[PDB]
């Protein structure tokens, strides 16, 4: 019943003391933190506490949208040699640093996921040519579904896939995705392997990655310019912003101290130094 | 006019949205439907119907009528498999083309129990006892009855009742398995071995066929709708 926006426990006025009770003495061998408050050690007056923990609630701590990835696509001229650039990105929070570390404060989580799409385009070649306002399809390809090989192949029919046709210039795109995990919680860290190396099998056949569950965990997004070739080249950058809503978490873990290296927990050399120089007897 | 503020997402078209929109033919007299026999309400309903499995997919037997026939014989008893099959209904060539798999090919995740049914198709006079077994994953796929017999199985006796059913009980680490080949969501192994042997009297065809069927169970479900690969349009 104690909500987030509740006033914190008050400070009780306590006077001088000379008794056989020892708030001050403990033993951190027990693993337990000694739970004291100012009054326990020094004389205090009465204080009606006003501050609340309101903002520090798990839900509020993740209430911000965050850039997960930057997908780049383009629409070149018809005569061109290179193909029209259409991107495919494996949906994961671990491509960027910020949001990841925040999510790493715990062992597991559940959250309905909100994605936002900020598209931004421009020309590239020195020319005064023209491009009419461009549209963009963002097709979510769940694991196993046919990944588009061309920018104009059958896959874009999306008879079952959930897509979003964004018209450039209008407000950023947004879609809601519930907790879609195969487990009873999303796993930030997975101490194990997908395969088991059997003895009646060759090492190769039984080998897999350390820390990985399913290579394809959530699927890929596919983004393409819908409008056809235009004599003047136009490149586009779609920025995805994720805001984890309705979030729950379990078992806290120490926050990442050294820079990330790969999708794993691994650390690169040359970054193994986080704390600076400070003399013990210097304030 | 009522003061409003446009929010993120406006003007965007979700292929999976569910909004109201204007009608092209206002006041259209719709013809009433009639009681057309056999109405379906859910895809799973079709999944629970038994469908014949193209087991033997050899280059010479694939894409033909021979694929569904698993031929047994009166050869002396051995411990070597008649048929092996991996539980990955939507990704194993054999299962992936049965009703179950097809429906499964439209979803990302599947869960529940499955049941295989084997139909003997020999002469009345032919007898025998076979063993169909489902071994959960995480170990060596059996190659001898000795191992297979250590898992989940049914010992089937061929007789007046021609069909036997072995249920594959939903035993998995995750609440839902991927509809694609994946180690993390692996399914295990389905195997069939001769319990005794096939015995036939004189003047009797010494070899015959068995037909396999598969179907989901009342507890089975599928989620996260997706596009299938079992079809395409080249240009």
């Amino acid at each position, epitope marked *: 019943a104690a909500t987030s926006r509740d006033a914190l426990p008050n400070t009780e006025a306590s006077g001088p003391t000379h008794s056989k009770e020892i708030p001050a003495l403990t033993a951190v061998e027990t693993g337990a933190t000694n739970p004291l408050v100012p009054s326990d050690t020094v004389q205090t007056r009465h204080v009606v506490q006003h501050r609340s923990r309101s903002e520090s609630s798990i839900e509020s701590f993740f209430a911000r949208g965050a850039c997960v990835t930057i997908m780049t696509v383009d629409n070149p001229a018809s005569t061109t040699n290179k*193909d029209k650039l259409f*991107a495919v990105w494996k949906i994961t929070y671990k491509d960027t640093v910020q949001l990841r570390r925040k999510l790493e404060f715990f062992t597991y989580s559940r959250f309905d996921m909100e994605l936002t799409f900020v598209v931004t385009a421009n020309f590239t070649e020195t020319n005064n040519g023209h491009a009419l306002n461009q549209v963009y399809q963002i097709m979510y390809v769940p694991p196993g579904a046919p*990944v588009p090989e061309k920018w104009d192949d059958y896959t874009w029919q999306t008879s079952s896939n959930p897509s979003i046709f964004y018209t450039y210039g209008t407000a950023p795109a947004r879609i809601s995705v519930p907790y879609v995990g195969i487990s009873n919680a999303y796993s930030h860290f997975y101490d194990g392997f997908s*395969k088991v190396p059997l003895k009646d099998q060759s090492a*190769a056949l039984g080998d897999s990655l350390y820390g990985a569950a399913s*290579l394809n965990d959530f699927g890929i997004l596919a983004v393409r310019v819908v409008n056809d070739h235009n004599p003047t080249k136009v490149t586009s950058k779609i920025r995805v912003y994720l805001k984890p809503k309705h979030i729950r978490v379990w078992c806290p873990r120490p926050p990442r101290a050294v820079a990330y290296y790969g*999708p794993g927990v691994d650390y690169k050399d040359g970054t193994l130094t986080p704390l600076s120089t400070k003399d013990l007897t210097t304030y | 006019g009522l003061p409003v503020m446009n929010t993120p997402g406006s003007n965007q078209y979700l292929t999976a949205d569910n909004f109201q929109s204007p009608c092209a033919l206002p006041e259209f007299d719709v013809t009433p439907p009639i009681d057309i026999p056999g109405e379906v309400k859910n895809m799973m309903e079709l999944a629970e119907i038994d469908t014949m499995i193209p087991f033997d997919l050899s*280059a010479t037997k694939k894409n033909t009528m021979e694929m569904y026939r698993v031929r047994l014989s009166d050869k002396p008893h051995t411990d070597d498999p008649i048929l092996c099959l991996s539980l990955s209904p939507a990704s194993d060539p054999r299962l992936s083309h049965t009703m179950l798999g097809e429906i499964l090919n439209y979803y990302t995740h599947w869960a529940g129990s499955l049941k295989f049914t084997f139909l003997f198709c020999g002469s009345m006079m032919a007898t025998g006892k076979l063993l169909v077994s489902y071994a959960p994953p995480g170990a060596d796929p059996p190659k001898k009855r000795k191992e297979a017999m250590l898992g989940t199985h049914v010992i089937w006796d061929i007789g007046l009742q021609s069909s036997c059913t072995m249920v594959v009980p939903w035993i998995s680490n995750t609440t839902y398995r991927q509809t694609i*080949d994946d180690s993390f969501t692996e399914g295990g192994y389905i195997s069939v071995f001769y319990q005794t042997r096939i015995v036939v009297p004189l003047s009797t065809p010494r070899e015959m066929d068995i037909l396999g069927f598969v179907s989901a169970c009342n507890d089975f479900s599928v989620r996260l709708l997706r596009d299938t690969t079992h079809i395409e349009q080249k240009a």
Partner: nanobody
Amino acid sequence: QVQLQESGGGSAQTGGSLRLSCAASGFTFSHGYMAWFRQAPEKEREWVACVRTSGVSAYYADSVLGRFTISQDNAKSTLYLQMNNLKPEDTAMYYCAATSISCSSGYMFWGQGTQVTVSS
């Protein structure tokens, strides 16, 4: 648009050697593996060999052991399959399956493949 395009041909005499290459693009998130697969004329698709992300740690298939060599050049973003001692069993199509992996089985990107023929 992770474009995987094989090259290397396939029309050698029995016993020779070929260099099977594969141009990779798009976004190959290094970490994982990069490999080779063969379908054969009339058999099931079979795993040939897999090499680690950037690491030159690899394995080979029992059938091909030592007679095939799979490396990489992540500077050139390519993988190579040198094949010495080609034989009548090696006659087949080869595919550069280099994406995700994590092992020697999982994929989200394949190539168009190329045929090899060891004649004699």
